[PDB]
């Protein structure tokens, strides 16, 4: 009678409680600094905030009953402790019998794991509250939060294919737009790194949060470019030029991504590097092959930040992109370096 998503969630939490298991407790108590109290405070603070926003209405999101709020929350808490135990148990330092205090005292990890659990529960129930609702409510930076998604997927194998697909989907949302907003911690991380943006080669074969993030960005973009370059023309494996152009804009024009979408710069790279190379070269009807990609939405090419104001993709291309990238584009030529494309 339950949906297979809710049925799966029920069998994951079966026989488990709102609290840390005896095993996890042992792990907590083998730390020089026992995290258990601060973890409980975090869940409690997240729990209050969640219920407050869940209950009170907005113009976008009408409020729901406290009883459901409490039920979603208890499920997420159960999920939280089960997954946390699995994460801690499988951790290298535990295998080697090393004090895990530092790992367990990172607040952003705990907040993110708990938010991700709330997200799983909400998705399972087909909640109207759509990501990134949960992290906006809980005041969680996308740039920090997204790293917990890979952890969750690999630490809970009871997750259905659909669940994993949804978690990967919200990771892509963070990688393509959410983490590039003007208030994103990404810009701060960039700042302490002296505004040096990882090239693609640098993150393939560094290692700070900046590196890991751009690694996932480049991978995501390469997958979308490869698909695009396997649909319309369809392209020469050059497309090493389109990639190189795109990488140029990430590295040497990172501001172009601020409050924008990753596909907007990818498609402009496609267009401009089409035009100059005298191959083929394609009009913005590129969208036909693009719109068939799952992440593609009309807002992506129909509403694009310009300066308020907003405009379509072609307009953004003409007023902003061309001026910034044409010095690079024109060197591929009638009258030379290329970036390695990841496979």
């Amino acid at each position: 009678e339950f949906t297979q998503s809710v049925s799966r969630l029920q069998s994951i939490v079966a026989g488990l409680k709102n609290a840390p298991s005896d095993q996890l407790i042992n792990i907590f108590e083998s730390c020089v600094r026992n995290p258990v109290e601060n973890i409980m405070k975090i869940l409690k603070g997240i729990g209050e905030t969640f219920c407050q926003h869940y209950t009170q209405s907005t113009d976008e999101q009408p409020g729901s009953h406290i009883d459901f709020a409490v039920n979603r929350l208890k499920l997420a808490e159960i999920l939280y402790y089960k997954i946390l135990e699995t994460v801690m148990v499988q951790e290298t330092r535990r295998l080697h019998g090393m004090d895990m205090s530092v790992l367990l005292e990172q607040d952003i990890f705990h907040r993110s794991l708990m938010a991700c659990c709330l997200e799983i529960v909400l998705f399972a129930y087909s909640s109207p509250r759509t990501f990134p609702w949960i992290i906006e409510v809980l005041n969680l930076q996308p740039f920090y939060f997204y790293k917990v998604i890979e952890v969750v997927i690999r630490s809970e194998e009871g997750l259905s294919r659909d669940m994993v697909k949804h978690l990967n989907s919200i990771e892509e949302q963070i990688l393509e737009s959410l983490a590039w907003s003007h208030d994103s911690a990404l810009w701060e991380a960039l700042q302490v790194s002296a505004n040096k943006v990882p090239t693609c080669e640098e993150v393939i074969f560094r290692t700070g949060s900046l590196a890991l993030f751009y690694r996932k960005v480049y991978h995501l973009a390469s997958v979308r470019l490869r698909d695009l370059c396997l649909k319309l023309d369809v392209s020469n494996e050059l497309r090493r030029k389109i990639w190189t152009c795109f990488e140029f804009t990430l590295v040497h024009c990172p501001d172009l991504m601020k409050d924008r979408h990753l596909d907007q710069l990818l498609l402009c790279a496609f267009y401009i590097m089409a035009k100059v190379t005298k191959e083929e070269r394609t009009f913005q009807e590129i969208m036909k092959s693009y719109r068939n990609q799952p992440q593609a939405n009309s807002h992506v090419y129909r509403s694009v930040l310009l300066k308020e104001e907003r405009g379509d993709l072609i307009k953004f291309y003409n007023t902003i992109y061309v001026g910034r990238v044409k010095s690079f584009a024109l060197k591929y030529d009638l009258a030379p370096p290329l970036s390695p494309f990841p496979h």
Binding site: Y271, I272, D312, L313, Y317, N318
Partner: peptide, 18 residues
């Protein structure tokens, strides 16, 4: 020569792509 695109998307999806 300019790389500007002379074109528009002000059309609608039904028309633009069928």
């Amino acid at each position: 020569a300019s790389l500007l695109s002379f074109e528009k998307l002000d059309r609608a999806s039904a028309d633009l792509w069928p």
